[PDB]
């Protein structure tokens, strides 16, 4: 009913001077791809359209950060954008965003790397993020909670079967979500500042995500 194979298929289907400008341009492009990803997650497109909107508006930044982070696992001290460009921490630091960039590396990329988080696992974590029953305005929170439950049930089964010798693996994956939440919130604060101050071109879809609410 929530087959990890479909979740993996979703990940696979979507696979590809100022670093802030380059990252923001890439985020705008990846927001289109994000919508196509979400549609491939079982039961998401059967939700009411307004709830699909709520979930993507609530989760886009965590979903995109998870994706580039896992893509960056083999990169030394940097990230790999979907555009193929590598951004090193030195460049982020020299642009005034070293602190948040270092959190990304230390709390997400290195940890994904250290445990060899696989694409099924990444896919499931993202699906958990997508199905966030705390998102405000949801027509039926319980339905989304139920979908989240089916995803983590499937993830645990996957982990226990694929990595039986690591009984804490499942918990380890779920315990990267508070870091992801914190990092996503900080990235949003930054984006709102770039918008306010005018220091960075912000493309239309990214801009829409920054619109009220």
């Amino acid at each position: 009913d929530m087959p990890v194979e479909r979740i993996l298929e979703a990940e696979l289907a979507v696979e590809p001077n100022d670093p802030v400008t380059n990252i923001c341009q890439a985020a705008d492009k990846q927001l289109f791809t994000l919508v196509e990803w979400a549609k491939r997650i079982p039961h998401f497109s059967e939700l009411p359209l307004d709830d699909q909107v709520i979930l993507l508006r609530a989760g886009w930044n965590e979903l995109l950060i998870a994706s580039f982070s896992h893509r960056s696992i083999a990169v030394k001290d940097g990230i790999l954008l979907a555009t193929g460009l590598h951004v090193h921490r030195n460049s982020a630091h020299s642009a005034g965003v070293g602190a948040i960039f270092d959190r990304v590396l230390t709390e997400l990329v290195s940890k994904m790397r250290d445990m060899q988080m696989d694409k099924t696992e990444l896919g499931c974590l993202r699906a958990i993020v997508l199905f966030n029953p705390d998102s405000k305005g949801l027509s039926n929170p319980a339905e989304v909670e139920a979908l989240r439950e089916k995803v983590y049930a499937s993830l645990e089964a996957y982990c226990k079967h694929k990595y039986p010798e690591q009984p804490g693996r499942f918990a380890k994956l779920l315990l990267r979500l508070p870091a992801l939440r914190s990092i996503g919130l900080k990235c949003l604060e930054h984006l709102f500042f770039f918008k306010l101050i005018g220091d960075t071109p912000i493309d239309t879809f990214l801009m829409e995500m920054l619109e009220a609410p």
Binding site: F32, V35, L49, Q52, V53, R57, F205, E211
Partner: peptide, 11 residues
């Protein structure tokens, strides 16, 4: 409101 997202999600 959120016109790009709605359009992409429709179909």
């Amino acid at each position: 409101k959120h016109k790009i997202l709605h359009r992409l999600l429709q179909d």
